[PDB]
Amino acid sequence: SAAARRELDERTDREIDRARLRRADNGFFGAARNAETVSAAAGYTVAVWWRQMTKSFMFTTLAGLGTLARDYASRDADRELLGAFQTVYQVIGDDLDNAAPEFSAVAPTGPAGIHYVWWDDTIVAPLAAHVPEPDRDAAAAVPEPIRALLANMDRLAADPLGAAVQLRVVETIALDIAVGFRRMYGKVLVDGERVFGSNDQFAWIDAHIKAETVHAAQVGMTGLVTDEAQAAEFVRLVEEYARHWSAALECFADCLTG
Amino acid sequence: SAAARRELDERTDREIDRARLRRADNGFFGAARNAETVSAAAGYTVAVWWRQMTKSFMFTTLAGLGTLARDYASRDADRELLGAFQTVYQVIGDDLDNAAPEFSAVAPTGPAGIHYVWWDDTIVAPLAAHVPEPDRDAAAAVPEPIRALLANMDRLAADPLGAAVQLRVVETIALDIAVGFRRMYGKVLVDGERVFGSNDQFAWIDAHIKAETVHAAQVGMTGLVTDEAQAAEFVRLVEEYARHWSAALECFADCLTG
Ligand SMILES: CC[C@H](C)[C@H](N)C(=O)O
Ligand SMILES: CC[C@H](C)[C@H](N)C(=O)O
Ligand SMILES: [Fe+2]
Ligand SMILES: [Fe+2]
């Protein structure tokens, strides 16, 4: 339980390395290179996929926290478990209640600020006007990779380590995705005009960029892990979850290169 | 779904009326009358029971929030559900992370401030020194009424309406319990001396008094309820939960009058 914590963290980054999730390796982040004016339709398709992915992420992570809590009503928890418990609760509050100042400063109030709602409202909606009603059945269909990620989430919703796994993996990729979104949606043209013209139209993306970059410079999630039996399962779950995340982001990449 | 909300709330207070939970009706709050120097042992017994009751309350309510969340990953939720979702998350943050200013101002930092921890540390511990190691097996035994409340909590942990039920019932009785605790522990004598001498030794109790009184003057939980099928079940669950809460508080009362 001593260097064990250090090895778990280093192994987890190894799993994320291997899953091809790093800035350099995942095809989606190369969307920067795809100056090819992202089609409004391509932007809509990814935006609608992302809406469900982030909605599921938030709800199944809160569900995963509830699952842990179920167990600790009875079992006595060390001060270290309780602190990681608190951390998970705090971190989840960003997506559900804009708890962090980088978000509350700018996000809409109340349920309008739930990040899958805020995203649906300022990204999915503008692009819908520029996409035909028949064309919107291309997103109504979620590719197997994206459906596999959502089902991994559903499983982790019921797993005593699911919150820890989802937050640990997503926090490492969150900035690259948010920068990928600012690049790709900055290249959506309607007869040569940016659908997303002004800076304020990017509020969601830039609050995440800000929140995430300052985070990665001021440094645990694995604090929930106690037995080496748990650490083994954590890595196993991380392997599965990171892999699904990468192939889902690959669908974003293929979408940009039809 | 219109006056339906109003009737649900009024019926819920009727159920709490009937369960004999109001200040006037539940035997525990009459502890004020029990000037009979509360025995340290009596204080210890109730404190240890309360520790588990509040620990279970917090964890099974968070668990109940996770259960709701499980469902809403997939199902589309109206802006009203989402707002009640946010409210439950906020309210739970008091007990888990001293979210409200009345608490963060005064509570210990980090896991030390989780209210069942903070209570164990400043109420259970002082009284333990004044209670013999053999005598502490009177609390190690939880009376059926208190065990029945804990099991109701465990069931509600897995119920899509459990959080709503627990928070709705507990918020109506929270001030009376906290005042009952300030009265009863102000009357614990060790050879004629207050075990709890100074005002600072009452920090936990008084933060709750403050947080709860200001709350009851600045006015929903049932926002989670949609169908009349849910409202019916809500009242049913409230009937069961309030009844268990009252008999558990009756065990506190009997304990003070051995
Ligand atoms: C998957 C979650 C990402 C990183 C971000 N928190 C959001 O609101 O979508
Ligand atoms: C049952 C919960 C009570 C009212 C209080 N919130 C506590 O910390 O114990
Ligand atoms: Fe977010
Ligand atoms: Fe509390």
Side-chain angles (χ1 to χ4, degrees), chain A residues 1-4 7-32 35 38-74 76-132 134 136 138-188 191-193 195-213 215-218 220-227 229-258, chain B residues 1-4 7-32 35 38-74 76-132 134 136 138-188 191-193 195-213 215-218 220-227 229-258:
Chain A
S1 308
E7 179 57 47
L8 186 55
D9 270 78
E10 293 178 30
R11 173 63 172 289
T12 301
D13 282 313
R14 239 175 273 139
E15 287 315 316
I16 293 144
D17 292 331
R18 288 195 244 282
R20 289 189 96 55
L21 272 166
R22 304 302 183 173
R23 182 194 284 115
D25 301 333
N26 187 273
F28 172 57
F29 312 128
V38 172
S39 103
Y44 181 88
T45 290
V46 169
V48 157
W49 292 344
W50 179 252
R51 190 187 57 206
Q52 186 53 229
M53 297 164 64
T54 185
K55 171 203 204 194
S56 282
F57 163 75
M58 172 182 85
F59 274 130
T60 57
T61 297
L62 193 52
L65 178 71
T67 299
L68 198 46
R70 267 185 213 201
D71 272 324
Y72 277 126
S74 53
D76 289 345
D78 37 278
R79 234 86 159 189
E80 270 61 32
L81 181 275
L82 298 185
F85 225 115
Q86 285 181 304
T87 297
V88 171
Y89 171 86
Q90 297 158 5
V91 172
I92 284 169
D94 288 341
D95 293 71
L96 178 62
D97 209 26
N98 291 296
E102 262 325 306
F103 286 119
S104 48
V106 84
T109 59
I114 292 157
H115 289 182
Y116 87 82
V117 184
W118 185 17
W119 171 270
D120 193 14
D121 279 354
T122 57
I123 302 300
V124 157
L127 293 157
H130 305 274
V131 168
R136 309 191 210 167
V142 175
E144 191 66 39
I146 289 179
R147 147 162 196 129
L149 173 58
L150 300 169
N152 203 163
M153 287 173 166
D154 289 325
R155 287 198 299 289
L156 291 183
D159 190 311
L161 321 179
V165 172
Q166 291 206 72
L167 290 181
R168 176 52 157 98
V169 163
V170 168
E171 70 165 341
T172 80
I173 59 185
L175 179 60
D176 291 334
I177 306 187
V179 167
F181 280 153
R182 219 213 192 274
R183 286 163 183 174
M184 90 168 264
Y185 285 104
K187 322 189 146 134
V188 181
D191 306 290
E193 329 317 337
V195 184
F196 303 105
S198 63
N199 229 54
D200 290 25
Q201 293 155 255
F202 284 84
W204 189 108
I205 291 164
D206 285 330
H208 281 86
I209 285 164
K210 293 183 209 201
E212 276 311 317
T213 318
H215 266 327
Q218 52 172 335
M221 211 47 61
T222 72
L224 297 176
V225 190
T226 74
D227 315 330
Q230 294 191 314
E233 181 66 12
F234 185 81
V235 175
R236 191 185 75 59
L237 289 169
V238 154
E239 194 281 322
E240 181 193 11
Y241 190 68
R243 169 165 38 82
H244 284 139
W245 255 108
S246 192
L249 288 162
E250 287 303 336
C251 298
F252 288 17
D254 294 342
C255 185
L256 284 165
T257 77
Chain B
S1 308
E7 179 57 47
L8 186 55
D9 270 78
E10 293 178 30
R11 173 63 172 289
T12 301
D13 282 313
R14 239 175 273 139
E15 287 315 316
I16 293 144
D17 292 331
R18 288 195 244 282
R20 289 189 96 55
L21 272 166
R22 304 302 183 173
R23 182 194 284 115
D25 301 333
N26 187 273
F28 172 57
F29 312 128
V38 172
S39 103
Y44 181 88
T45 290
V46 169
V48 157
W49 292 344
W50 179 252
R51 190 187 57 206
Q52 186 53 229
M53 297 164 64
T54 185
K55 171 203 204 194
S56 282
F57 163 75
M58 172 182 85
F59 274 130
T60 57
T61 297
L62 193 52
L65 178 71
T67 299
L68 198 46
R70 267 185 213 201
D71 272 324
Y72 277 126
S74 53
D76 289 345
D78 37 278
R79 234 86 159 189
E80 270 61 32
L81 181 275
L82 298 185
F85 225 115
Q86 285 181 304
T87 297
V88 171
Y89 171 86
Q90 297 158 5
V91 172
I92 284 169
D94 288 341
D95 293 71
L96 178 62
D97 209 26
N98 291 296
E102 262 325 306
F103 286 119
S104 48
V106 84
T109 59
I114 292 157
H115 289 182
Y116 87 82
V117 184
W118 185 17
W119 171 270
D120 193 14
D121 279 354
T122 57
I123 302 300
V124 157
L127 293 157
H130 305 274
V131 168
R136 309 191 210 167
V142 175
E144 191 66 39
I146 289 179
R147 147 162 196 129
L149 173 58
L150 300 169
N152 203 163
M153 287 173 166
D154 289 325
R155 287 198 299 289
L156 291 183
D159 190 311
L161 321 179
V165 172
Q166 291 206 72
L167 290 181
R168 176 52 157 98
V169 163
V170 168
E171 70 165 341
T172 80
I173 59 185
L175 179 60
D176 291 334
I177 306 187
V179 167
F181 280 153
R182 219 213 192 274
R183 286 163 183 174
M184 90 168 264
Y185 285 104
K187 322 189 146 134
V188 181
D191 306 290
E193 329 317 337
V195 184
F196 303 105
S198 63
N199 229 54
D200 290 25
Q201 293 155 255
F202 284 84
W204 189 108
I205 291 164
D206 285 330
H208 281 86
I209 285 164
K210 293 183 209 201
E212 276 311 317
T213 318
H215 266 327
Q218 52 172 335
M221 211 47 61
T222 72
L224 297 176
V225 190
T226 74
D227 315 330
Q230 294 191 314
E233 181 66 12
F234 185 81
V235 175
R236 191 185 75 59
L237 289 169
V238 154
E239 194 281 322
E240 181 193 11
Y241 190 68
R243 169 165 38 82
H244 284 139
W245 255 108
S246 192
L249 288 162
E250 287 303 336
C251 298
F252 288 17
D254 294 342
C255 185
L256 284 165
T257 77

